[PDB]
Design an enzyme around this catalytic site. Structure first.
Site, PDB file in Angstrom:
ATOM      1  N   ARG A  80     -75.516 -14.236 -48.413  1.00 54.60           N
ATOM      2  CA  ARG A  80     -76.904 -14.482 -48.008  1.00 54.60           C
ATOM      3  C   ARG A  80     -78.000 -13.790 -48.827  1.00 54.60           C
ATOM      4  O   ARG A  80     -79.186 -14.046 -48.614  1.00 54.60           O
ATOM      5  CB  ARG A  80     -77.093 -14.140 -46.530  1.00 54.60           C
TER       6      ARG A  80
HETATM    7  C1  LIG Z   1     -82.276 -19.264 -47.293  1.00 60.23           C
HETATM    8  C2  LIG Z   1     -81.219 -19.512 -46.222  1.00 60.23           C
HETATM    9  N1  LIG Z   1     -81.222 -18.712 -45.057  1.00 60.23           N
HETATM   10  C3  LIG Z   1     -80.261 -18.907 -44.042  1.00 60.23           C
HETATM   11  C4  LIG Z   1     -79.276 -19.920 -44.177  1.00 60.23           C
HETATM   12  C5  LIG Z   1     -78.235 -20.115 -43.053  1.00 60.23           C
HETATM   13  O1  LIG Z   1     -78.462 -19.165 -41.988  1.00 60.23           O
HETATM   14  P1  LIG Z   1     -78.117 -19.521 -40.464  1.00 60.23           P
HETATM   15  O2  LIG Z   1     -76.874 -18.627 -39.990  1.00 60.23           O
HETATM   16  O3  LIG Z   1     -79.385 -19.184 -39.543  1.00 60.23           O
HETATM   17  O4  LIG Z   1     -77.753 -21.080 -40.326  1.00 60.23           O
HETATM   18  C6  LIG Z   1     -79.259 -20.746 -45.358  1.00 60.23           C
HETATM   19  C7  LIG Z   1     -78.176 -21.860 -45.520  1.00 60.23           C
HETATM   20  O5  LIG Z   1     -78.146 -22.589 -46.546  1.00 60.23           O
HETATM   21  C8  LIG Z   1     -80.242 -20.537 -46.385  1.00 60.23           C
HETATM   22  O6  LIG Z   1     -80.242 -21.329 -47.536  1.00 60.23           O
END
Ligand SMILES: Cc1ncc(COP(=O)(O)O)c(C=O)c1O
Ligand SMILES: Cc1cc2nc3c(=O)[nH]c(=O)nc-3n(C[C@H](O)[C@H](O)[C@H](O)COP(=O)(O)O)c2cc1C
Ligand SMILES: Cc1cc2nc3c(=O)[nH]c(=O)nc-3n(C[C@H](O)[C@H](O)[C@H](O)COP(=O)(O)O)c2cc1C
Ligand SMILES: Cc1ncc(COP(=O)(O)O)c(C=O)c1O
Lengths: 211, 211
Positions: A178
């Site tokens: 992430r």
């Molecule tokens: C910038 C970004 N933040 C978060 C996520 C996924 O986080 P979450 O666990 O809230 O689905 C992604 C998935 O591609 C992402 O590109």
């Protein structure tokens, strides 16, 4: 300088390397597909998919009908933004800059290079206009075919292209953990800059941003 | 009425059917991935990829940091546009409407539902702020982990979500022969309309456009 993780300090030459890796990916069909964001002078945005048709120092080129919604918005407000997203690679590229309509001559040259069926298609389809059903088009299209049989399809007056001139280019690289990599290139003055702000080719300035 | 080729006269219920077919496609990884277009009051557009997080009658929901560029643009100009593109299906969906920030309570509920690592990630990453290198983040992230070990990660004040309320929804379906299907739903008044303009559920009005 054990550098960031880029290939070039040139935003356009960096896009090139990323673009080529996309073209060479079996899982990406339309690597030159991009979403074009535009808006009215007021501040009402709009966006639609588009194919990038050529790029370089001059900018990013694309073609459409000047009378389509996007045309009427770019002409009354020469500012646009582009987003390239290649999921298979988890990469995103963003381009911001002023738009400049292309020379009717070049449009013409490019127009006649397309497959005849695409040219005819640009003439029957008065893009963005209302119609009765899908047959209406199948019909016009058929008629214009026999018409232009063994003939050159004239480039519609309202048909042309634009070129975005890179004022801001961003590179996003999703990571498993992430902590996505993200570098932003922007043309600044201070020819005298931030501690984390670095020098890019030309009048280019880049820096990393928190994802 | 031997109809157009849709599943519902409801733009949102139509998106649903198309969205489900995308989710069920092995070749599409992030079917809820969309490009969000926004702009300043002046008329300077911007766009970036985003994940759609829930949708329905209320609208299309997504979350970000209110202090990110997109936040500062939506707050000073509550208008946005969305583009969904699913190449494997050659389908495109466009959504236009006014944006309304979500209730801090709901954001909170949704925030704590995310994986802890995603929550922590939203706290170390003061999204859109400048930084020195990729390690700076790997470090902060690590530190906050041991900090919030066996603890609840508080939702950053500047972290929340918005919901786009469907004023205009478009459906594009690429065809091999280039005569792409394209229907536009827009909420009009004349509760008294065009010959090719048809009635959609609610105050919805649709019509086909030349591709
Ligand atoms: C910038 C970004 N933040 C978060 C996520 C996924 O986080 P979450 O666990 O809230 O689905 C992604 C998935 O591609 C992402 O590109
Ligand atoms: C993958 C893909 C590529 C496209 N390429 C173009 C293009 O190069 N030029 C164009 O005018 N429309 C293109 N379109 C259609 C546009 O997204 C849009 O429907 C059309 O230009 C009318 O948009 P507008 O009304 O905002 O002007 C493409 C659609 C898809 C799904
Ligand atoms: C597939 C994909 C999904 C993304 N989803 C989100 C999201 O839900 N929210 C978000 O704030 N950024 C998301 N991003 C990152 C944004 O595109 C962008 O880099 C970030 O929000 C900062 O943009 P801004 O500076 O215009 O605000 C995503 C990127 C990709 C490539
Ligand atoms: C709307 C539209 N027009 C034209 C094309 C391709 O035409 P050309 O032969 O100019 O590459 C595409 C390809 O996806 C398209 O989506």
């Amino acid at each position: 300088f054990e550098e960031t993780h880029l290939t070039s300090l040139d935003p356009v030459k960096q896009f090139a390397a990323w673009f080529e890796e996309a073209v060479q990916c079996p899982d990406i069909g339309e690597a030159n597909a991009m979403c074009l964001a535009t808006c009215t002078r007021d501040g009402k945005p709009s966006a639609r998919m588009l194919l990038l048709k050529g790029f370089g120092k001059d900018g990013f080129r694309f073609f459409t009908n000047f009378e389509s919604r996007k045309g009427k918005e770019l002409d009354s407000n020469p500012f646009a933004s582009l987003v390239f997203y290649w999921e298979p690679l988890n990469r995103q590229v963003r381009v911001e800059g002023p738009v400049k309509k292309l020379p009717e001559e070049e449009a013409e040259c490019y127009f006649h290079s397309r497959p005849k069926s695409s040219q005819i298609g640009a003439v029957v389809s008065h893009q963005s206009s209302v119609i009765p059903d899908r047959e209406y088009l199948r019909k016009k299209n058929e008629e214009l075919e026999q018409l232009y049989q063994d003939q050159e399809v004239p480039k519609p007056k309202s048909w042309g292209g634009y070129v975005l001139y890179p004022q801001v280019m961003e590179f996003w690289q999703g990571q498993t953990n992430r902590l996505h990599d993200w570098i932003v290139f922007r043309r600044g003055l201070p020819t005298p800059l931030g501690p984390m702000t670095h020098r890019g080719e030309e009048d280019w300035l880049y820096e990393r941003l928190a994802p």
